[PDB]
Amino acid sequence: KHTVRAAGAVLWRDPATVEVAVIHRPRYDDWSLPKGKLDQGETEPVAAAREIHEETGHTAVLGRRLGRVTYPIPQGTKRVWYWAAKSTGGDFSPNDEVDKLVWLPVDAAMDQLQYPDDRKVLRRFVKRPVDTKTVLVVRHGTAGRRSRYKGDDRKRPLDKRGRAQAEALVAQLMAFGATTLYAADRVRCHQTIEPLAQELDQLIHNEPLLTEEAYAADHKAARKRLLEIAGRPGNPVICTQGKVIPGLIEWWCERAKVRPETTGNRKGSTWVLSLSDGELVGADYLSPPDEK
Numbered sequence: 001k002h003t004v005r006a007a008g009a010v011l012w013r014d015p016a017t018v019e020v021a022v023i024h025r026p027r028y029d030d031w032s033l034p035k036g037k038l039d040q041g042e043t044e045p046v047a048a049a050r051e052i053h054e055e056t057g058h059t060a061v062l063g064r065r066l067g068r069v070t071y072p073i074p075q076g077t078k079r080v081w082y083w084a085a086k087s088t089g090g091d092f093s094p095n096d097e098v099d100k101l102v103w104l105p106v107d108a109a110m111d112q113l114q115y116p117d118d119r120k121v122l123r124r125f126v127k128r129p130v131d132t133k134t135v136l137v138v139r140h141g142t143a144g145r146r147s148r149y150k151g152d153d154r155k156r157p158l159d160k161r162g163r164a165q166a167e168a169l170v171a172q173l174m175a176f177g178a179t180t181l182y183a184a185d186r187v188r189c190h191q192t193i194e195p196l197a198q199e200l201d202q203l204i205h206n207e208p209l210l211t212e213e214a215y216a217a218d219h220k221a222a223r224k225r226l227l228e229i230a231g232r233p234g235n236p237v238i239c240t241q242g243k244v245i246p247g248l249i250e251w252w253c254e255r256a257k258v259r260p261e262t263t264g265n266r267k268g269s270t271w272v273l274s275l276s277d278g279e280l281v282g283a284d285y286l287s288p289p290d291e292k
């Protein structure tokens with residue numbers, strides 16, 4: 001019943017014309033997909049990107065999430081979440097952890113992978129486009145509690161936990177190749193992506209149409225604005241509030257007939273929206289960085 005958390009990837013290069021990486025490990029004599037256990041304080045996407053680079057030598061950009069594999073181990077239950085990950089280069093060198101890496105088209109990869117669950121991941125990988133662009137919709141971090149004033153406090157800041165959530169979100173959002181930054185017109189939303197702003201040296205665009213008060217006054221304008229942002233070149237991060245996100249996500253998924261595998265709305269959480277030719281093809285809910 002104790003869960004060991006891990007993450008990994010279908011790492012690919014070049015539609016089933018791509019090649020995917022399959023690794024061999026001499027400790028187990030197995031062929032499998034690269035993956036590994038989360039370190040203290042990592043989230044799954046951070047661990048996936050790190051373990052990809054450690055086991056294959058390649059850097060990569062994560063995209064669509066491809067489901068979860070569990071299996072019993074002496075410690076309890078091993079849990080692996082998998083992402084599609086596009087190689088951004090690197091070179092493999094054999095060692096004692098991983099002694100071989102082969103790049104295979106999907107069909108021959110399916111023959112090489114010994115675990116049925118890995119084959120299931122790879123089937124998911126091919127079901128939808130993999131060369132995707134990415135929108136990251138983030139609910140701001142923890143910011144104490146609303147006062148008894150009607151509606152909303154413009155300037156309430158992140159609390160200490162929330163500031164730490166903001167710092168922890170840099171690595172997670174960098175894992176998906178975030179490039180451009182947007183925040184609803186509340187201090188707490190800006191402060192959530194300010195650490196990422198500093199890392200990228202990028203300015204945070206301000207978004208009055210995406211606050212809770214605006215969504216409630218004019219939801220059509222909020223939806224239009226999301227699409228406008230998503231249509232721009234780059235991979236945008238959009239930080240907004242709890243009353244806004246569920247409605248926007250549900251609307252987009254409905255219209256494009258995308259089924260989210262997980263759902264939630266926690267402060268510090270992230271929705272990874274994968275697009276192919278402007279069409280939504282994945283909506284993946286990630287837990288806040290300090291929650292399970």
Ligand SMILES: Nc1ncnc2c1ncn2[C@@H]1O[C@H](COP(=O)(O)OP(=O)(O)OP(=O)(O)OP(=O)(O)OP(=O)(O)O)[C@@H](O)[C@H]1O
Nearest residue numbers: 006028030032035036037038051069071078097115117118
């Ligand atoms: N998809 C699957 N379904 C069922 N069983 C699977 C399986 N994959 C591996 N095993 C089987 O479980 C045992 C532990 O392997 P593991 O879960 O891959 O263990 P691990 O902790 O050695 O490997 P990672 O989780 O990949 O850990 P790291 O990369 O973090 O390890 P590191 O310390 O080498 O970095 C092995 O005998 C293996 O054949």
Ligand SMILES: Nc1ncnc2c1ncn2[C@@H]1O[C@H](COP(=O)(O)OP(=O)(O)OP(=O)(O)O)[C@@H](O)[C@H]1O
Nearest residue numbers: 143144145146147148149150151152212241242243
């Ligand atoms: N005074 C209030 N007026 C209206 N809604 C409130 C009020 N207080 C709490 N809520 C509701 O409860 C939720 C959580 O409020 P809390 O004070 O914990 O966080 P918050 O930082 O304001 O969150 P968000 O900015 O995501 O709405 C809000 O999203 C809102 O739906």
Ligand SMILES: [Mn+2]
Nearest residue numbers: 034035036037
């Ligand atoms: Mn591993």
Ligand SMILES: [Mn+2]
Nearest residue numbers: 035036051055
């Ligand atoms: Mn490893």
Ligand SMILES: [Mn+2]
Nearest residue numbers: 035036037051
């Ligand atoms: Mn490891």
